[PDB]
């Protein structure tokens, strides 16, 4: 029901990461100076329970380690009648997004063993949500963040359409498919699109008008990596993420036992190389 | 070249609270005059009385740049807010006629100069302190935006594999915008945007929910919302629609609005 005021517990600093996420802030735990991400929602009485929802979502399902964890929520009263402001507070991921990571890499491409590592983490996080019957619904490079520590965490899980390039065929509505059937395997598609984003600096169809991409995704065969340089194992993993008909798309668990994710011998060095890459740019 | 906006304009705040994005309310540091300032990280059509006038640009460098685009400031806020702030989420019928006419007047100007607004909706239709209606955000990206004011030809779909923008798409949006004024929401608002993108091309033309509206109003809606854009009238043709053409109470209307602008302010 009623919560608490943030004043003297948390503070904005503020504003991430260019408004791209909306009303989200770099914030700080006043007592310890620990950073944290902060969502600020203007509230009413019509929203009321959608809010009550957003919270139980995070509190329940944020406790894995591949998911940015819930911190707590706060009510920051506004002048009577006016709109109050809700403070959704979570773990802070200081090393930016995968989108950013690839952006900042010469030739905008990640090493295979990096892609393996990051994919696995995404899959571990997704596995956790799926086992709780939550569909993420918006896996793309931007919703996948690094910690200072090279830990991987998912955000923004559970009026605009926004960007379509990471969308699975089954979630775009058309005559064949008038009700857009989000299934848990939709996430896995987006995971495959994200791996390509890491491999190539951008999703398939990036060069197209988004309206056009939205039209094409359901009709094209599975996207493929442009280059032949990649390992068979990786070609195979992409092909698994991007089975056109989600009915035949492997489960999260099935993909976690995919050799490309499973057999990561050099992950030791990868986590190291990653931290280093972060710190330099840091 | 392009001045630095320091000493000339101060960003007072983000307008519509993020709604329009990185667009602020600025104030001239010396003169006090207000403007809208669209801020962009980077690498002669507005001087019609129904198009918010463009004041010019400033340059703020540099990497690790930001471009400033300055434009007249519209005090009374969007007509989306106006409807919101109107008891019963409905504007008065002759309020809608006057506003629609002003929309068409701006569009005509745009169209005569071969420009497609591309994004008519209650939010891109703004009011000055003095009850003047003015258009913003005309025909300037990775995000499919909000679908509800979108004309059918603009949506890529099974028989429209290549979306068509056409000056006539604006008139469809004008029609939806009038419904918004009537009911506070465009049709299918209750729908998930993805679902709405699917139905706009498929469904018959949307309609007012209420039977209380005048014949002329139903007709003007009907006129704007011709599904096939090839068979949809011009801006100029619609200006001649009785609903737009015959406004006796224009005077009372302007009055009634200026007032509201202050009252509900
Ligand atoms: C903050 C919040 C509270 N409830 N839901 C959220 C989401 C909003 C969408 C972006 N998500 C980010 C975006 C940027 C970020 N940057 C750093 N750390 C984060 N956790 C972070 N999270 C968090
Ligand atoms: C500022 C700008 C520069 N180039 N294009 C614009 C548009 C961005 C979309 C919103 N548009 C608004 C929104 C709210 C507003 N509020 C008051 N006055 C305005 N002119 C105004 N304009 C203006
Ligand atoms: Mg966790
Ligand atoms: Mg003007």
Description:
It is classed as transferase/transferase inhibitor. The entry lists the keywords kinase, Transferase-Transferase inhibitor complex. The assembly is dimeric. MAP4K4 T181E Mutant Bound to inhibitor compound 1. Chains A, B are Mitogen-activated protein kinase kinase kinase kinase 4. 2 copies of one chain form a homodimer. Chain A is α+β, with helices and mostly antiparallel strands and 282 residues long. Chain A folds into 2 domains: 1-92, Phosphorylase Kinase, domain 1, CATH 3.30.200; 93-282, Orthogonal Bundle (Transferase(Phosphotransferase), domain 1), CATH 1.10.510. The first copy, chain A, is 34% helix and 13% strand. Chain A has 9 helices and 7 strands. In chain A, strands 1-2-3-5-4 form a 5-stranded antiparallel β-sheet, covered by helices on one side. A two-stranded antiparallel sheet of chain A has the order 6-7. In chain A, helix 3 (112-131) runs antiparallel to helix 4 (186-200) and helix 4 (186-200) runs antiparallel to helix 6 (232-241). The N and C termini of chain A lie far apart (40 Å). Chain A binds chain B through residues 18-19, 22-23, 42, 159-165, 171-175, 178-180, 209-212, 214-215, and chain B through 17-18, 21-22, 41, 141-148, 154-158, 161-163, 192-195, 197-198. The complex binds ligand 3C8 (2 copies) and magnesium ion (2 copies). One copy of the ligand Cc1c[nH]nc1[C@H]1CCCN(c2ccc3ncnc(N)c3n2)C1 is lined by residues 16-17, 21, 24, 37-39, 68, 88, 90-93, 145, 155-156 of chain A.
């Amino acid at each position: 029901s009623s919560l608490r005021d943030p004043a003297g517990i948390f503070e904005l600093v503020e504003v991430v990461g260019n408004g791209t996420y909306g009303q989200v802030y770099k914030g700080r735990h006043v007592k310890t100076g620990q950073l944290a991400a902060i969502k600020v929602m203007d509230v009413t009485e019509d929203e009321e329970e959608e809010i009550k929802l957003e919270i139980n979502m995070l509190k329940k399902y944020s406790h894995h380690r591949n998911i940015a964890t819930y911190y707590g929520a706060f009510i920051k009263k506004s002048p009577p009648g006016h709109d109050d402001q809700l403070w959704l507070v979570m773990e802070f991921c200081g090393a930016g997004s995968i989108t950013d990571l690839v952006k900042n890499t010469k030739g905008n491409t990640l090493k295979e063993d990096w892609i393996a590592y990051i994919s696995r983490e995404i899959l571990r996080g997704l596995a956790h949500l799926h086992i709780h019957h939550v569909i993420h619904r918006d896996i793309k490079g931007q919703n996948v963040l690094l910690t200072e520590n090279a830990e991987v965490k998912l955000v923004d899980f559970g009026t605009f359409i926004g960007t379509p390039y990471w969308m699975a065929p089954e979630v775009i509505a058309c005559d064949e498919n008038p009700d857009a059937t989000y299934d848990y395997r939709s996430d896995l598609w987006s995971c495959g699109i994200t791996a390509i984003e890491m491999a190539e600096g951008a999703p398939p169809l990036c060069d197209m008008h988004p309206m056009r991409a939205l039209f094409l995704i359901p009709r094209n065969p599975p996207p493929r990596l442009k280059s032949k340089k990649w390992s068979k194992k990786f070609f195979s993993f992409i092909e698994g993420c991007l089975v056109k008909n989600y009915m035949q798309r492997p489960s999260t668990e099935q993909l976690l036992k995919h050799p490309f994710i499973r057999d990561q011998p050099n992950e030791r060095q990868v986590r190291i190389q990653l931290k280093d890459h972060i710190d330099r740019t840091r």
